[PDB]
Amino acid sequence: LFVALYDFVASGDNTLSITKGEKLRVLGYNHNGEWCEAQTKNGQGWVPSNYITPVN
Amino acid sequence: LFVALYDFVASGDNTLSITKGEKLRVLGYNHNGEWCEAQTKNGQGWVPSNYITPVN
């Protein structure tokens, strides 16, 4: 699993909204490593790389 | 709860060892905010502030 460290409000680039301490599962990156495609109990989308942690 | 983002090997200052993705409970800080006094399934001690996350 992965957990959210900060809140992210979805803007453009079909992003996803995420709240702190949230459980998400990472499916892959974007190349330069700046965005992750994730799934939560709410859906699937791009979230910033430094907002989540591979720990947990 | 709190979760560990990186591994910390206990040195001096009666620190505690912690592994990534670990669950710990914070009891208080040290003042300048650089160290946290925590408890895990292994014990209790000082760990660096930026090594853990209040999320989870």
**Amino acid type, B7:** D
Residue A19 to residues B17, B46, B53: CA-CA distances in angstroms?
A: 28, 28, 13
Q: Which domains does chain A carry?
A: 1-56 (2.30.30.40)
Query: Structure resolution in Å?
Result: 2.8
A:B CB pairs within 8 Å: 31
Residue B6 to residues A7, A18, A47, B24, B33: CA-CA distances in angstroms?
A: 21, 22, 21, 13, 18
Strands (E), chain B: 2-4, 23-29, 35-39, 44-48, 52-53
CB-nearest partner of B4 from A4, A6, A55: A55
Contacts 24+ apart (CB under 8 A), A38-44: A38/A2, A40/A16, A42/A16, A42/A17, A43/A16, A44/A16
List of chain A residues whose C-beta atoms are within 8 Å of the C-beta of residue B6: 55
Chain A residue at shortest CA distance from B56 = A21
Residue A40 to residues A45, A55, B5: CA-CA distances in angstroms?
A: 9, 16, 20
